[PDB]
Amino acid sequence: DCHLSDMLQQLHSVNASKPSERGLVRQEEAEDPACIPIFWVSKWVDYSDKYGLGYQLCDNSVGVLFNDSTRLILYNDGDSLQYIERDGTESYLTVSSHPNSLMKKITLLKYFRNYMSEHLLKAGRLPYLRTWFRTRSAIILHLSNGSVQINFFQDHTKLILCPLMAAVTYIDEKRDFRTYRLSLLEEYGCCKELASRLRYARTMVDKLLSS
Template identity: 30%
Template structure:
């Protein structure tokens, strides 16, 4: 990556003493103290101007601006300017050296190029086109980046060619059989997370994630999910038989894979899209059709890319996402399907967190949907929607593979069966573990 800055409109030849004429010239915001004081200036004044340019590029405004000209000139002489706290220590240090009031204390160009700001940390190989409109995303630390790059290199070839990501194929019949066993954890140099052994769908604990709000507090989402469960539990007297239900399109995760000890928790939605909640709290999803990718860094803003425009630092995470999606598409059976077409998930739809024990797994999504999957009975329970659109959808072994949905009015009129009541209590217990 090269940046060339040139402006020779006020260039002058350096005299025998190493100084130019004592003249006041140049853009006022970028003039060095020796230029303002007319004490004679030379190449060190250009170093000062580089400091102003660097400050402006990193903050969006020049270091010396917004004041009457005499006051601004005094600030320049004193080297007095705002120091943004959001800049990295290496950036602040280099700016301080470049904007030293004494020209002799400023670094040479060779020293600038050897500064930690340019030699340490992450430097992108290239910048995507969208950087002209919005900041590029560089979200994870180098150690995690190296890990995911290795995963991408070693493991992505295990599932080539890439699986198609279409709603039709993603909702087709899956692999039948008993519940998969636990996927064995492997070392970095070991087997890929796409082994011949089958996948255990439950795990103890929950991923660390701070996606709920800037403070990383999931309490509002958990409380909303808890209220939904209480609405069902308190809807009416215990029903002796199943209440009347109907088939409704429901967005939920019929497939998932837990590799959270090393990488993250992957899932496939009923609309055919796939997502991964990574160990660092970030979330990435691949949406059909068209294959656009949405990414939200930990406590960060949602970014959406075309598949071909995913930034280089995120390609390793994309490789892990596609690997998980390929594994789920090819090797995992579905826990039920929905025949009614499901509206595609919005780009900001994501898995916030999960919790599990030996009996059940609960998934909490960003739109308020709660999914509870039970290990022994293989029953799936999904609570979705709000108000009049609220639905409790149930998949049971031997029942319709499309699932049966119950509105809140139906539950109030007929109540829940003892089995549904017990499922809700187990899900409620797991939700309380997330608090």
């Protein structure tokens, strides 16, 4: 609900302004360092047919959203866990304590972690993956802190949407991050690439809310 509702409003607003259909476009004036995100998804692995979606955050913590709708997170210390039950209630444990209830989920998480470490390149309180889906053209990753990340398959471009700061970070095809306040894009406008991706984003956030 709330952060996604806000993000949807922010996007309606900027896309409303038709920010690429200008004549004077001064995108760099829309940039805002106060708004650079702390967390985004660095890597992901879809084994959703059998197990779930594994991912790594940019602080090197990893998480899995299992097919039974529970979540397990391993912090970047390599031992601290956070487990999120199907009702959102959280508990904290350690791999080293060998918790009897979770050993199969821990083992699956370590398999995802190793796979990501060995085989995937990086994109660039601690949130978890709250919801995701994929379309033919993107994967959409909604984090429990309200952020929505959209990674576009064709050109490796990505958006990180931050409703708390009404801001978006665009990762272009060279892995360069630029962070913009949406209200400033309305005024100074932007390139058609950023504007078309923000139109797509509005559609995706609408689906997230409705699903």
